[PDB]
Amino acid sequence: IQTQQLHAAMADTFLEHMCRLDIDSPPITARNTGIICTIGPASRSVETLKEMIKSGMNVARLNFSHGTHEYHAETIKNVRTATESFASDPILYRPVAVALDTKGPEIRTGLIKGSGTAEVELKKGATLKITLDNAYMEKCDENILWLDYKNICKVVEVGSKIYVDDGLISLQVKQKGADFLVTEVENGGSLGSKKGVNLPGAAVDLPAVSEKDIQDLKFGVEQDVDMVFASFIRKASDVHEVRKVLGEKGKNIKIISKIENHEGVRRFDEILEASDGIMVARGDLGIEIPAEKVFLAQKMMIGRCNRAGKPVICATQMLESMIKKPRPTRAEGSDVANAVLDGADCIMLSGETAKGDYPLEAVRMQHLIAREAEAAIYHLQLFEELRRLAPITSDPTEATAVGAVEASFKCCSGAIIVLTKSGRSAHQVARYRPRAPIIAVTRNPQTARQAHLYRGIFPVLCKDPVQEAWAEDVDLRVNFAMNVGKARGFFKKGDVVIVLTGWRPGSGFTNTMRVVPVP
């Protein structure tokens, strides 16, 4: 009762649950919410990556809006060197997924005075000309600004608003020309090179998948990435385009659709159906739609992803102040906790890990907050509603999954151990949101990496050879999971755990649930 918020867990109402939340009730060891870290100059070394893994990084995200293939290939090599440095003991080895985040249909400005790091300070109530004349693509300054959206003039009008750099610089269109726009600075500030531009009024007509995106996706297949985070998905056909480009060689790569504009929110259901998962890409979303509405979009998408059993990621500015400071703001601590309470499978760090001064501290803080928030979930109602809203099916795997989760609550189990080839069995357990960690034992390295997308899954990669006698191969993997849970302090000899197995080899036959004491 006095740990894991178990007193609050037993409340008969949500209000009383809130009233019983206890800062002196410490959480379990296991942290269920996956942490996605963007890798860049601050976190790209093998040395730092080892520490990022030890601090809780589950997925390395590469943002292809920046950097050459050479650069990203080296980052990927370093991630794998760091990750495989722990491979000698499979009991302690932590799989690490690699994610390719596409540029997509972005608009960006040019170079301020010929340099990538130069800046000019735009005073408010000034005049600024936007041009498409490539003569100025590297000669941006206080007076003239080039950007790379050739067809911009057709989709904007006088009075249209144009936003630059995370929506912070604000411009109003006064006149239009053949290949320019004369604007007045509505909100000023420093203007740097190659900054993101948004046209919230307008229907931007760029390709769902550009030539650059084709190149990058090919690279992703060549580099054996686990997942693609696809930028600016507006409709199911965009998802299908990425899927078709990845083609047969990339058929097992998971597609996470990033929702970052009004159309994506409107067509969310068809996007979700077509996708392997979703990212709430709050950065651009909060520029494209009023910032005060983002929380509605966030909770709608997390809700709908939870109902569908598909992974959802909360992204962007979660611990933003930690780019410059060792500790986060109170709003940031709140945001991370509330993303977990909403139901997000994963949470993400961008500049905080890619470029900031405290990457390890940012990972460590997400880890601490997620674990406290996981204990604070009102499982009583959540599990009731998930059961009630679930399609009724004669599928034996689904019945075993729900039985296992019910059982896990009844005996407050230290874990649910699941043997899985493709991950699907463990995903089915995760969809019902147990408190207990799900130890997913697999021999498939890609399954192990991809499983990090799901709340609660702790993937472990068995490297023991296959035993002649299948039943004894099954027991070998179960015992492996016992060794892992024990070594990582999830449970100890005599605790009770749940174990899911199947009746024959191959995927699709999980049907056996056992409640067993830890050896």
Q: Which of residues 18-57 bind a copy of itself (CB under 8 A)?
A: 18-24
Q: Least CB distance from residue 334 to a copy of itself, whole Å?
A: 4
**Dihedral Cα 421, 435, 301, 312, nearest 10 deg:** -40
In whole angstroms, the minimum distance from the beta carbon of 372 to a copy of itself comes to 5
Q: What is the DSSP letter of 323?
A: G
Q: How far apart are CA 272 and CA 278, in angstroms?
A: 7
CA distance 449 to 355: 24
| Shorter beta-carbon distance to a copy of itself: residue 199 or 302 | 302
- Flag whether 47 is marked binding: no
Least separation in angstroms between residue 89's CB and a copy of itself is 28
What is the b/e burial string over 180-192, where b = at least 16 CB atoms within 10 angstroms of the residue's CB?
A: bbbbebeebbebb
SS3 147: strand
E strand or H helix at 366, and its extent? helix 359-375
* 178 binds a copy of itself, rule: CB under 8 A: no
**Is 258 noted as a catalytic residue in this protein?**
yes
What tokens does 270 get?
Answer: 């068809």
d(CA 495, CA 24): 24
Tokens representing 343?
């139901």
CA distances from 323 to 42, 250, 318, 468 (A): 10, 34, 11, 53
User: Does 282 sit near a copy of itself (CB under 8 A)?
Assistant: yes
Using the rule CB under 8 A, give the single segment among 9-17, 66-74, 81-89, 93-101 that binds a copy of itself: 9-17
Q: How far is the CB of 37 from a copy of itself (least distance, A)?
A: 17
Measured from the CB of residue 405, what is the shortest distance to a copy of itself in angstroms?
Answer: 8
CA terminus-to-terminus distance, the chain: 25
Give the residue, chosen from 334, 463, 464, 507, that forms a contact with a copy of itself under the rule CB under 8 A. 334
Q: Which is nearer to a copy of itself, 132 or 401 (CB)?
A: 401
Q: Which residue has the tokens 């996706």?
A: 217
Residue 342 in the binding site for a copy of itself (CB under 8 A): yes
Strand-pair partners of 184: 127, 172
> In the range 437-496, which residues lie near a copy of itself by CB under 8 A?
496
- Is 316 among the residues known to form the active site? yes
The CA distance from 496 to 116, in Å, is 58
Stretch that binds a copy of itself, among 55-63, 69-77, 249-257, 281-289 (CB under 8 A): 281-289
> Is 276 or 372 the residue whose CB approaches a copy of itself more closely?
372
108 in a labelled binding site:
yes
Does residue 189 touch a copy of itself according to CB under 8 A? Answer: yes
| Given 75, 316, 397, 510, the catalytic residue | 316
Let me know: does 427 contact 405? Beta carbons within 8 Å. Answer: no
The one catalytic residue in 235, 254, 258, 431 is: 258
Positions in 345-374 near a copy of itself (CB under 8 A): 365, 368-369, 371-373
Q: Which of 20, 54, 108, 325 is catalytic?
A: 108
CB of 368 to a copy of itself, least distance (A): 4
Binding flag, residue 202, a copy of itself (CB under 8 A): no
**CB of residue 105 to a copy of itself, shortest distance in Å:** 21
Task: Tell me how far CA of residue 210 lies from CA of 103, 226, 236, 242, 381, in angstroms.
Answer: 9, 21, 17, 10, 45
Which residues, 54 to 83, sit near a copy of itself by CB under 8 A?
none
Give the residues across from 259 on adjacent strands: 280
Residues 206-265 contacting a copy of itself, CB under 8 A: 262, 265
Segment 286 to 315, residues that bind a copy of itself, using CB under 8 A: 286, 289-300, 302-304, 306-307
161: three-class secondary structure by DSSP: strand
Q: Is 159 annotated as a binding residue?
A: no
According to CB under 8 A, which residues from 122 to 141 bind a copy of itself? none
Residue 326 neighbours by CB under 8 Å, 6+ apart? 358, 361
Q: How far is CA 219 from CA 161, 212, 215, 252, 256, in A?
A: 36, 11, 6, 15, 17
Q: Is 80 marked as a binding-site residue?
A: no
505 contributes a contact to a copy of itself by CB under 8 A:
no
Residue pair 434/387 in contact by the 8 Å Cβ criterion: no
For the segment 371-410, give every residue that binds a copy of itself (CB under 8 A).
Answer: 371-373, 376, 380-382, 384-390, 392-400, 402-410
Minimum distance from CB of 22 to a copy of itself (Å)? 7
Q: State the Cα torsion 297-217-239-147 to the nearest 10°.
A: 60
Annotation-wise, does 262 bind a ligand?
no
Active-site annotation, residues: 61, 108, 258, 316
- Residues in binding site: 58, 61, 63-66, 94, 101-102, 108, 195, 258, 260, 283-284, 316, 420-425, 452, 470, 477, 504-509
